[PDB]
C-alpha cells in the first residue's frame, strides 16, 4: 500500500503470505489459533501476525514511513490440529530485525505477551518457536553448561544427587547448616535452598550463606568429594541479588540458584552473565505446569519456556517431577530433556516439535528431577534422565528414619547401583526392584529406606 | 537407629562394595562399547582431590581389548603401589569423561 | 583417525573434503594459493586448511581428545585463477 486511507481494514491482504518461504534468519512461531466464529482461518492467522508485529487495529499513516513488507510478521502456512477442529495451526515468520539482540523474552512478549486478537481470534496458544542460529548466537546462554560444570566439580559417569533442605521454611541458619552438613557428608553432591528461602526473619541470608559454606567445606573435607549448596540469591531488587551473589563468590560457594518465576528474565539474564564472569554455577528453578504451562489449550507450552531459559542462561533447570507423569507424557519428557542438552533438535510432531531447533555451540543444561521421589524411583530416573541430570531428593533424604546422612547414603547407593547395572547392560527399569534389593543387602541405610516408602 | 560412619569416598561407585575383577571388566567393556577411550590416572592419596592426577602413559585411544586396559592397570599399580589408581574413559564427542572410578584406593 | 601415531603426515586425507557442502554458519575463505613445486593442489589447499585451524606440522596425541571432524577447517573446492596458472583458488570452510 502506497497511499494513506484511514479506517479499520482486514489483515489478510498484508499479513497472510501463503507463498512465503521463511528465511533462515526468521523467528518462526507456531500458534494454535481458535478464531472468532465466522472469521476465516487465513484472516485470523493474519490478525495474529499483525498484532504480534507491525499491525494496528486501524490503519495508521506512519506505516508508510517504513517498509512494512520487510518488517511485518506474516503467516505463511495453516494446518489442522490432529484431534480438534475448532483450532488450527498458524505458522508465522518474524524478521530477525524485530527483536533486541540477546533479549529472548522481547521475542516472547512480542509474540504472546500483549497479543489480544484484533477481534479475529478467541483463543491463542504458542506451541513452538524456532530461534534461528543467528539469534541464538546473540544470547548469553548457560554460563558454563554440562561439560564445564562436570569439569569444575570433577564429577563424571553418573547423575548428580541433590536435596532441598526441609522444612521449606522455619529453620535458623545454624540448623540449616546442620541439615546441609549431614546431607553432604552422607553422599549427596549438592544441597539447595528452597526456592522461597531468600532472607526471612528466622534466617537472614548472610547468616545462612556463612553457615552453609562452613557445612559445605566440612563435608567436603570429610568425604574427599567436591560438594556444593545452591545458595538462593533471588532478591527483591537487582542490587540485592548481585550483593548476595557477590557474597556467595567471596566465601567460595561454587553454585547459586535463582527462582526465575520470582526474579524474572531481566534479573536472571543479568545473573547468568555475572555467573560466567565470576565462574559460579547457576541453578534455575522455573515451575512449569503452574499458572503458565499447565492449561493445554491456553498458554505457553513448556518447551518454549525451556528454550527461553536456556538462552537466558542457567547451568541447571528444574520444573516439576517426571516419574509421576504418565507413560504418555514420557515422550514429552524425553523431548524436553533434548531441548535442554542437545545441539540440534530435529522436527518431530509426535513430541510437539514443529521446527528444527539448532543451538550450535550453545552449552547444554543439566535437567533436574525433583518432587516426592525416593529410592524406588531411582531406576526410572536413571533410565529417563541419563547421566547429565541432577536428581534432587529433598524429603527422600531428610525423611529417612535414621536422619540426613543415612538418607543421603541410601540415595547414593541406590543411584550407583542403578548406574552400575545400566552400564552392565541390564534393563534397570524392568529389573529395578532386584537391583535395589541386591544393593540393599550391603547398605542397611538403603534397606530401611526401601521399607520406609512404597515400591 | 544406626549411626552413619564417616569415611573418605572416591566418587562414582565408591558407595558400592569394592569391585571384583568382573565388575571392573564390565565397566571397561561399557566404556569401550560407548566409543570412549580408556585411560589410567594415579596420584598420591593425599592429593586425590587435585584436578590433575598423574596420567599413566597416554589414553589408550581406539583400544578395543579390555584385557589390554586391565594389564595397563596392573602395570600402573606396580610402578606406583602406594598411589590411588583411577580408570577414566575419555569421550571426545563431549570432551568430557564418560566414566571414571577408582580401581585401587592406594595406601 | 582413532589411534595415535606420532610423525609428520600429509594433510590431504583430513583437510581436503571435496564433497563438503558449507553450512550456512561456516566462515568461508577464498585463498589464492601458489603451491611449492611438486606439491599437489589438493594437498596444498589441505595444508592451508590445517594450519589456519586445527592442524599441526606433526601429528599430536591431543587431537584425539576432541573431534577434529567437527572443528577442522576443510578445503572443499579448487578453481583455476583466470590468467595465472601457477596459482589456484582454494575455498576453505571454517
Amino acid at each position: 500500500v502506497k497511499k494513506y486511507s484511514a479506517g479499520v481494514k482486514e489483515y489478510r491482504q498484508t499479513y497472510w503470505m501463503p507463498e512465503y518461504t521463511p528465511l533462515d534468519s526468521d523467528i518462526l512461531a507456531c500458534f494454535k489459533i481458535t478464531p472468532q466464529p465466522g472469521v476465516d482461518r487465513e484472516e485470523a492467522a493474519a490478525a495474529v501476525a499483525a498484532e504480534s508485529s507491525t499491525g494496528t487495529w486501524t490503519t495508521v499513516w506512519t506505516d508508510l514511513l517504513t517498509d512494512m513488507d520487510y518488517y511485518k510478521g506474516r503467516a505463511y502456512r495453516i494446518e489442522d490440529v490432529p484431534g480438534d477442529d475448532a483450532a488450527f495451526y498458524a505458522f508465522i515468520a518474524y524478521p530477525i530485525d524485530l527483536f533486541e539482540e540477546g533479549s529472548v523474552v522481547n521475542v516472547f512478549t512480542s509474540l504472546v505477551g500483549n497479543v489480544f486478537g484484533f477481534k479475529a481470534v478467541r483463543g491463542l496458544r504458542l506451541e513452538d518457536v524456532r530461534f534461528p542460529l543467528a539469534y541464538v548466537k546473540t544470547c548469553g546462554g548457560p554460563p558454563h553448561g554440562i561439560q564445564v560444570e562436570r569439569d569444575k566439580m570433577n564429577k563424571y559417569g553418573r547423575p548428580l544427587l541433590g536435596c532441598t533442605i526441609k522444612p521449606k521454611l522455619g529453620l535458623s541458619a545454624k540448623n540449616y547448616g546442620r541439615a546441609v552438613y549431614e546431607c553432604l557428608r552422607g553422599g549427596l553432591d549438592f544441597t539447595k535452598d528452597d526456592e522461597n528461602i531468600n532472607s526471612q526473619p528466622f534466617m537472614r541470608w548472610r547468616d545462612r550463606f556463612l553457615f552453609v559454606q562452613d557445612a559445605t567445606e566440612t563435608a567436603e573435607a570429610q568425604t574427599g568429594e567436591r560438594k556444593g549448596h545452591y545458595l538462593n540469591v533471588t532478591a527483591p531488587t537487582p542490587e540485592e541479588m548481585y550483593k548476595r551473589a557477590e557474597f556467595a563468590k567471596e566465601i567460595g560457594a561454587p553454585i547459586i540458584m535463582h527462582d526465575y518465576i520470582t526474579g524474572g528474565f531481566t534479573a536472571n539474564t543479568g545473573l547468568a552473565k555475572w555467573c560466567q564472569d565470576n565462574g559460579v554455577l547457576l541453578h534455575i528453578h522455573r515451575a512449569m505446569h503452574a499458572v503458565i504451562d499447565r492449561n493445554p489449550n491456553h498458554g505457553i507450552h513448556f518447551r518454549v519456556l525451556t528454550k527461553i531459559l536456556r538462552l537466558s542462561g542457567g547451568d541447571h533447570l528444574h520444573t516439576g517431577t517426571v516419574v509421576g507423569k504418565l507413560e504418555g507424557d514420557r515422550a514429552s519428557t524425553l523431548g524436553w530433556i533434548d531441548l535442554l542438552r542437545e545441539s540440534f533438535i530435529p522436527e518431530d510432531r509426535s513430541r510437539g516439535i514443529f521446527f528444527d531447533q539448532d543451538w550450535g555451540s550453545m552449552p547444554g543444561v543439566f535437567a533436574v528431577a525433583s518432587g516426592g521421589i525416593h529410592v524406588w524411583h531411582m531406576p526410572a530416573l536413571v533410565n529417563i534422565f541419563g547421566d547429565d541430570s541432577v536428581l534432587q531428593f529433598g524429603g527422600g533424604t531428610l525423611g529417612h528414619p535414621w536422619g540426613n546422612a543415612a538418607g543421603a547414603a541410601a540415595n547414593r547407593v541406590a543411584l550407583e547401583a542403578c548406574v552400575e547395572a545400566r552400564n552392565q547392560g541390564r534393563d534397570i527399569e524392568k529389573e529395578g526392584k532386584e537391583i535395589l534389593t541386591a544393593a540393599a543387602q550391603h547398605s542397611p541405610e538403603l534397606k530401611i529406606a526401601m521399607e520406609t516408602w512404597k515400591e | 537407629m544406626q549411626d552413619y560412619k564417616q569415611s573418605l569416598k572416591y566418587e562414582t561407585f565408591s558407595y558400592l562394595p569394592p569391585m571384583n575383577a568382573e565388575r571392573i571388566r564390565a565397566q571397561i567393556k561399557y566404556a569401550i562399547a560407548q566409543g570412549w577411550s580408556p585411560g589410567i590416572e594415579h596420584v598420591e592419596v593425599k592429593n586425590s582431590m587435585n584436578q590433575y592426577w598423574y596420567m599413566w602413559k597416554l589414553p589408550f585411544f581406539g583400544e578395543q581389548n579390555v584385557d589390554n586396559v586391565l594389564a595397563e592397570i596392573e602395570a600402573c599399580r606396580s610402578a606406583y603401589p602406594t598411589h590411588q589408581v583411577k580408570l577414566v574413559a575419555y569421550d571426545n564427542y563431549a570432551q568430557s569423561l564418560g566414566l571414571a572410578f577408582v580401581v585401587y584406593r592406594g595406601n | 583417525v582413532k589411534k595415535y601415531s606420532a610423525g609428520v603426515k600429509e594433510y590431504r586425507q583430513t583437510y581436503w573434503m571435496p564433497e563438503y557442502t558449507p553450512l550456512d554458519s561456516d566462515i568461508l575463505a577464498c585463498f589464492k594459493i601458489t603451491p611449492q613445486p611438486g606439491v599437489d593442489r589438493e594437498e596444498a589447499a589441505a595444508a592451508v586448511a590445517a594450519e589456519s585451524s586445527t592442524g599441526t606440522w606433526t601429528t599430536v596425541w591431543t587431537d584425539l581428545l576432541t573431534d577434529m571432524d567437527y572443528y577442522k577447517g576443510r578445503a572443499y573446492r579448487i578453481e583455476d585463477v583466470p590468467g595465472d596458472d601457477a596459482a589456484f583458488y582454494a575455498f576453505i570452510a571454517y
Binding site: 554440562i146 561439560q147 542438552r341 542437545e342 545441539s343 540440534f344 528444527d356 539448532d358 550450535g360 552449552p363 547444554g364 547429565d388 | 569421550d91 564427542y93 563431549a94 570432551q95 568430557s96 | 553450512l23 573431534d67 567437527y70
Partner: peptide, 9 residues
C-alpha cells in the same frame, strides 16, 4: 554428547 548430534552431523 555436545558435538555428537550436531546439524553438521
Amino acid at each position: 554428547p555436545r558435538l555428537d548430534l550436531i546439524e553438521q552431523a
